[PDB]
């Protein structure tokens, strides 16, 4: 799980929504290019 380590990474990111569904995609080992396209699309909504 490492929910605490995911929050540690988020605080490391130091931004302004755990976002660990993406860490689940990392567990599935999704690709960075599709990840970037998905991030841009989810940002647009």
């Amino acid at each position: 799980a490492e929910e605490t380590e995911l929050f540690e990474l988020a605080q490391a990111a130091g931004g302004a929504e755990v976002f660990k569904i993406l860490v689940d995609l990392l567990k599935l080992n999704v690709a960075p290019l599709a990840v970037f396209q998905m991030l841009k699309s989810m940002c647009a909504g």
Partner: protein
Amino acid sequence: SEFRIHHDVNELLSLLRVHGGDGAEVYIDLLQKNRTPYVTTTVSAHSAKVKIAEFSRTPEDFLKKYDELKSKNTRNLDPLVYLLSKLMEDRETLQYLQQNAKERAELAASAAASSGPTWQQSLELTRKMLRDKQSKKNSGQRLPVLPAWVYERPALLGDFLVPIGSLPLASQEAAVVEDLLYVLVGVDGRYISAQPLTGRQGRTFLVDPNLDLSIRELVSRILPVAASYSTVTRFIEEKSSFEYGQVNHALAAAMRTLVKEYLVLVTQLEQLQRQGLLSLQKLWFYIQPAMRSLDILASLATSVDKGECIGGATLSLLHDRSFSYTGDSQAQELCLHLTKAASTPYF
């Protein structure tokens, strides 16, 4: 499961406040044919780290975490670091994610208000938790675990637990050599002292005031390898835990085999020491031969322990280290030897 997109990506579209557009459904489809059982993240990670630090408004925490996350040596921190850097690239994507998230954050906030390091303790918690974990994995089996008496007899390895007010410079060097030899054997100094390990450590030296400033400076090089050796003995004991593993035991025994080489060099210098024909500079010359090797050996041990390396964790750490121990050709070959041997423990 195979449809874990429904749990993650579909809820990414819904919960992310992204219902227009494709949401994270097409994103689920994109990551589905891009999700591998293994990892193929070969990339200039240094370049990605530089880009992240460059875009890091508060780069202190960014770089600190770039080091700290490797302390646990977690799973594929490079993908998350690259994502954290490339997402900072698109302010429009970042601002749109801020729209998708901050509004829901405000909604949740409104809905909320309405209605020190002791080596003993750090290792005892680890030992008890690992005993429980091995019991859980056994699921109704015993364990060739280390004994309670093994945990008892404190300093079971015999661990490292003189007036020099006006000593002549030569006598001061001799007495300092005697103190440092005792420290190398894990014993107390002659005119100075050494507090025990502050948890993960060797011996936190307390140099004698009468130790010359030049003498203290020369001893400063020794103290690194001394703390390294003490922590190395402690780490060998840690890997000796059956909770650490039978493979960890094999690694510790291989270290003990080289540790004999350490005591061997201690005695080799002790030959001239009993002869009284050694010198501070001569000692520094001999130490340089393997003083670095002491810290090199403690390095992989700390890598395994700090990652709590169970299973192929320490194996992967070892193989990566062997691929990087070049330049230190001695460590490049020694780690390969340890790898080849301890493979058979699992191989």
